[PDB]
């Protein structure tokens, strides 16, 4: 970290940029808080994620694998809903 470079950037942007944050301007504002919650994968999600990670290295690009993994992390039903079973 070279604080001089950052100060140089600030000075460069100084004559043109005007910034106002709600915290310093509007005091009469309720506070905000941010929470980060970790979750574990289910057996179905774990199997699908591991399968995709294995298929990653062998035709699908890193973007395709990335999107599939995001869908898996969202919900495994986004690939195939659990079947409704009925007699033959």
């Amino acid at each position: 970290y070279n604080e001089g470079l950052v100060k140089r950037l600030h000075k460069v942007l100084r004559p043109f940029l005007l910034r106002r944050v709600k915290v310093d301007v509007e005091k009469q504002m309720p506070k905000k808080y941010e929470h980060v919650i970790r979750c574990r994968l289910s057996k179905r999600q774990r199997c699908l994620y591991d399968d995709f990670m294995a298929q990653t290295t062998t035709f699908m690009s890193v973007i395709n694998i990335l999107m599939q993994l995001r869908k898996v992390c969202n919900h495994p039903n986004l690939f195939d809903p659990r079947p409704v079973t009925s007699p033959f």
Binding site: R8, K11, R14, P15, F16, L18, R20
Partner: protein, 154 residues
Amino acid sequence: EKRKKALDLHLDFIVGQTEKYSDLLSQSLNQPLTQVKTPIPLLLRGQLREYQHIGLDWLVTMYEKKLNGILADEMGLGKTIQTISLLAHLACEKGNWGPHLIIVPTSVMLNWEMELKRWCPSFKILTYYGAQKERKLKRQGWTKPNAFHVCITS
């Protein structure tokens, strides 16, 4: 080796010019009569907040210095109202009644038109919404001076 020195000296030159501009703006903004130089325009017909009035003064200062700037006020602080006050001030005092263009999102087009009508009914507002035939019909005879003051388009 020479690439680093050339880049450093070029950046130093740019920084020097920017510092000169910043010093000129600081000198212009520090002129005495809280001590806001730009008064409220009589055509504003509204009450601005203290920070809004400071923003208006900054906008007029940037205009007089003939410099472009970014207004990065966070969401909801009233950038639209500050801009409307700037236009009213310039038009009344500076005589800058000329046709101004305000480019906004289509969703915000109605809201901006409403704000313009609420704060400064004096301004001739032109709205560019509609199909090609309607747009051409509204454009008909727009080259005449003093035909429209503010144009809104997406």
